[PDB]
Structure formats: C-alpha cells, structure tokens
Amino acid sequence: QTKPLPALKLALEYIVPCMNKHGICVVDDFLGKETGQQIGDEVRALHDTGKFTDGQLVSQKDKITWIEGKEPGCETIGLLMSSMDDLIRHCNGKLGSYKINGRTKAMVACYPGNGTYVRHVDNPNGDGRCVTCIYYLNKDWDAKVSGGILRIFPEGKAQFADIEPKFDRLLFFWSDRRNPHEVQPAYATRYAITVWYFDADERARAGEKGVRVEL
Numbered sequence: 582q583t584k585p586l587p588a589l590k591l592a593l594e595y596i597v598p599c600m601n602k603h604g605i606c607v608v609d610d611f612l613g614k615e616t617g618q619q620i621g622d623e624v625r626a627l628h629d630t631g632k633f634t635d636g637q638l639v640s641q642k643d644k645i646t647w648i649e650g651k652e653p654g655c656e657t658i659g660l661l662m663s664s665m666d667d668l669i670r671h672c673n674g675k676l677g678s679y680k681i682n683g684r685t686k687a688m689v690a691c692y693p694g695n696g697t698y699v700r701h702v703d704n705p706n707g708d709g710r711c712v713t714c715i716y717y718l719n720k721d722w723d724a725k726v727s728g729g730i731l732r733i734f735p736e737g738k739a740q741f742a743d744i745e746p747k748f749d750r751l752l753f754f755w756s757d758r759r760n761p762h763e764v765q766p767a768y769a770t771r772y773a774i775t776v777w778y779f780d781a782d783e784r785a786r787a788g789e790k791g792v793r794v795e796l
C-alpha cells in the first residue's frame with residue numbers, strides 16, 4: 582500500500598524543517614531496492630576494474646573516484662545525482678539564508694573496513710560548501726558486528742546523532758563547524774557516494790572539491 586513521496590513534499594514537509602531545526606536529516610528508502618542495487622553494482626564495477634585512487638594521497642601534505650554522471654557505466658550514479666539535485670532545488674531559498682547555485686561532482690568511495698576516521702569538519706574555512714549529502718550502498722549492514730557508525734555532534738546542542746551507513750539511506754547535514762563528525766571503526770567493506778552543495782556568496786568570497794558544477 583506504499584507510494585514514493587513527491588520531491589516537493591519530501592523537501593518542504595520533511596527536509597527543510599529537519600535541517601533548519603537539527604542541521605541533520607536522514608531519508609531512508611530514497612531510490613528503492615532496484616535503483617540502489619544498480620548504483621551498488623556500478624560502484625563495485627568501478628572498484629573491481631581499478632578506477633579508484635588511494636584516498637590518503639588526496640588529503641595529505643580508503644579509495645575514491647570523482648564521477649560527473651555521464652561517463653560509461655555510471656548512468657544510475659547520474660540518476661542519483663539528478664534526484665539529489667531535485668530535492669535541493671525544491672528546498673533552495675529555505676535552507677537557512679543559503680542560495681545554492683551548484684555542487685561538486687560525486688565522490689565515490691570504498692572504505693575497506695579494517696579498523697579504519699577522526700572528528701573533523703568538512704568545511705572549516707569557508708570554502709563555499711554548505712550542505713553535505715551522503716548516499717550509502719551497504720546491503721544488510723549490521724552495525725553491532727561491523728561498526729562504521731557515523732557519529733555527528735551538532736555544535737551547541739545537548740544531543741548527538743548515530744547514523745548507520747545503511748543501504749539506500751540519503752543523509753544531509755550542514756558542512757560547516759555546526760557538524761563535527763567522526764566515523765567509528767568498521768570491520769567490513771563499505772561504499773558511499775558524497776556530494777557537497779555550494780552557497781553562491783560564500784563560494785564567490787572564498788582541487789576537485791572546489792569545482793562547482795550546475796545542478
């Protein structure tokens with residue numbers, strides 16, 4: 582007896598108030614089992630064929646790739662991105678005073694899970710990114726056995742959030758200092774896709790994390 586929520590309804594009746602109140606918003610069953618397993622297979626195919634780069638080489642002074650959405654074998658990742666963009670479009674105007682004029686490409690990541698991430702802020706220095714969006718791909722993830730919980734500590738609140746990296750879960754949170762977060766050790770392989778959305782004013786006033794594409 583079940584139906585998908587129209588994006589406008591999901592954005593305005595849930596995402597906007599959740600974000601404005603808590604700065605964090607979880608949406609389960611975002612795309613359904615079929616589209617989600619297709620994304621998983623595409624992500625796993627990229628990994629098996631050796632298209633990922635060591636993530637420690639990116640950050641220094643996990644394994645990742647950046648997906649635009651139109652590449653061969655990434656069609657459904659492109660659809661995920663379109664569906665995310667639609668939600669943000671229906672929100673835009675009402676997520677704080679942000680006006681979102683773009684986003685990064687999709688960061689597709691494999692986290693091997695062998696006791697691997699410390700508390701950090703995604704955007705500490707006003708790099709322009711205002712909303713972090715993560716989509717998880719781990720079928721039948723059991724956190725008791727496997728770990729890998731994202732813990733978020735909203736700043737100046739007497740509460741925190743424990744987000745399992747669950748299949749077909751879409752997560753939004755403010756990328757700035759409001760949401761320091763850590764990832765507890767994991768003991769199985771994980772896949773996720775992260776996109777960051779840009780506020781126009783902060784972006785204009787400021788690698789691949791600094792590349793704004795249109796929605």
Ligand SMILES: N#Cc1ccc(-c2cccc3ncnn23)cc1
Pocket residue numbers: 692698715717718719729731746762764771772773
């Ligand atoms: N599944 C899964 C999965 C695991 C770890 C992270 C990860 C790594 C490093 C920093 C960071 N910040 C927020 N998530 N996250 C993201 C997704």
Ligand SMILES: [Fe+2]
Pocket residue numbers: 701702703762
């Ligand atoms: Fe993070």
